From a paper:
To determine the crystal structure of YngB, selenomethionine-substituted protein was produced in Escherichia coli and purified as a C-terminal His-tag fusion protein. The protein crystallized as a dimer in the asymmetric unit and the structure was solved at 2.80 Å by experimental phasing. YngB displayed a Rossmann fold with alternating α-helices and β-strands, which is commonly found in nucleotide-binding proteins. More specifically, the YngB monomer contains a central β-sheet surrounded by α-helices. Similar to the dimer interactions described for homologous UGPases, hydrogen bonds are formed between Tyr102 residues on the two β-strands located at the interface of the monomers, producing an extended central β-sheet spanning across the two subunits. The overall structure of YngB is very similar to homologous UGPases including A4JT02, GalUHp, and GalUCg as shown by superimposition. The outermost C-terminal α-helix is one of the most variable regions and absent either in GalUHp or in a different conformation in GalUCg. The structures superimposed with an RMSD of 1.61 Å and the putative UDP-glucose binding pocket could easily be identified in YngB. Based on this alignment, it can be predicted that residues Gly110, Gln105, Ala13, Gly14, Glu29, and Lys28 in YngB interact with the uridine moiety; Asp 133 is involved in the chelation of an Mg2+ ion; Asp 134, Val 204, Gly 172, and Glu 191 interact with the glucose moiety; and Lys 192 interacts with the diphosphate moiety. From these data, apparent Km values of 45.6 ± 3.24 μM (GtaB) and 42.1 ± 20.2 μM (YngB) were calculated for Glc-1-P and 49.5 ± 10.2 μM (GtaB) and 62.9 ± 13.8 μM (YngB) for UTP, respectively. kcat values of 1.06 s-1 (GtaB) and 0.264 s-1 (YngB) were calculated for Glc-1-P and 1.04 s-1 (GtaB) and 0.293 s-1 (YngB) for UTP, respectively.
Numbering used by the authors:
A (entry chain B): 3 to 222, 228 to 297
B (entry chain A): 2 to 222, 228 to 298
Amino acid sequence: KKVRKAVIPAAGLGTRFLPATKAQPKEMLPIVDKPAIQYIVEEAAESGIEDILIITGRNKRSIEDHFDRSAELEFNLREKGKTETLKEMQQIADLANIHYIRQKEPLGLGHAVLCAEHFIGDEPFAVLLGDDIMVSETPALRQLMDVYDVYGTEVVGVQSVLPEDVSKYGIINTSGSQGHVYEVNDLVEKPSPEEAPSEIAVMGRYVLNSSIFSVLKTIGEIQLTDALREVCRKEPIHARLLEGNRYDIGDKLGCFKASTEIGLMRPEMRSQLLAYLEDVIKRETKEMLR
Amino acid sequence: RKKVRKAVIPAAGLGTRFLPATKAQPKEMLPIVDKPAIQYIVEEAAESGIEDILIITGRNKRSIEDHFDRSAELEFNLREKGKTETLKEMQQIADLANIHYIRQKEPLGLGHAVLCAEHFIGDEPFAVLLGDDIMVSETPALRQLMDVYDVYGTEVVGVQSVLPEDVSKYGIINTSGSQGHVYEVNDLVEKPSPEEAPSEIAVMGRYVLNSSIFSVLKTIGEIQLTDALREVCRKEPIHARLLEGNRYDIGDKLGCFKASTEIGLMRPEMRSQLLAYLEDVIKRETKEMLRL
């Protein structure tokens, strides 16, 4: 069974970005000129996912609207000649088939994954937390999916991190390592620097099975790791080192960084940007020498 | 001899220059540093001593109206998390001014937009602020315009100079001369070719107008605000104020990025990490370029 369905939980009230997000959702904050959520749906589509369930909350209509056809916008783009544009707008609505479900009250990412139960039903599915953007010749998810196609168990997405960071993330407890594909025997959430049995963390990407669904039912906020953990006791899961560049967007500054770097891949903005940063640094030195 | 206390902020664009960000959400809500662009404009107004703002809004721009109101679910979550600093901050936003909205029913640009405001202001002087730039100033930009009005009581336009190339990006003043910080506008073109332009002094989407401007705007009528200063010019000449502080255009993607960086570097909590990051990027770009 090929992975063809994915789950983006998106019910955060996103308080870290106040006041940008007082009256609009975190998932829509622009990254270069793209809403964060678009990057994630783009990953999925490019990995060959055909159906996404977005677990949404109150006042996130704008997400649903983003991925539909905006009539008034289509008209106005025509009457102005922006055909290349009108076309890029239509493609957004074509990426995937976007389903939505409301998470009732905020009970966390475990609840959220359970809400997907009947939608994915009896297929393996991808989960994508919307917390980092991945630049890669092979889409992050597609990577996790290729490990799945092989092992057929719960695969996790991973990247090494510097110790004294391990408390912010999670952790592969590896006792083996083969290919670009570590092998997982256990798991810990937010391990104190010493408690941490590795330097490798999971990068908000997953492929799971319906199995996991029942497992998470049983265990039952409901942390999703404990389930990926109680699967590991019965059997060993798998993790892929994610080839590509990772931009954490949990922070205000995280978003700043992400915008600049992705900015730098745009040809038209690369030199304009880079020039501009040179001249900001000059101005800052000159000022500080007075 | 009346005080300016009402401003009109026209806000009914589809924000094409910003697609796909603005596909399903308004241009004025795009964040500059961590605050919506629209909030900057209200803030300038508030601190300029404006008490009553009319936003001329369009369809699917509810988020502006929500932004400046109590947000009960947010409030709750903030209390139940302790962020009393933030809860107070949010509460402040909702207090900056008296925000009124009207829908401009059909998009006929500014001018019509301004006419929309007619009954709301009735018979006073008012400010218009198009939001195309953020000004960092000791004295709030609009206040500066207002102080020249207090003295000359004509329509007063806010200005700064620009390099000749970009004089078709603007409306250009046409002085006889100047006196302290107040130029003496004799006429006004729309957006002139670099030689057709009779100055390199451009209007910075600030205006303090008089109620009279309505009569005017009606006679001319696609109603351009500029032409209705042109006619006010025929009978009698208008004033301009050179605007004290630092301007950051945000009409462009790049503009906004520059704005975010500039304003960001002014925030103490941010400054050191941001500067750090910036130096880093250049350092990293150098290494990788020299090895190629």
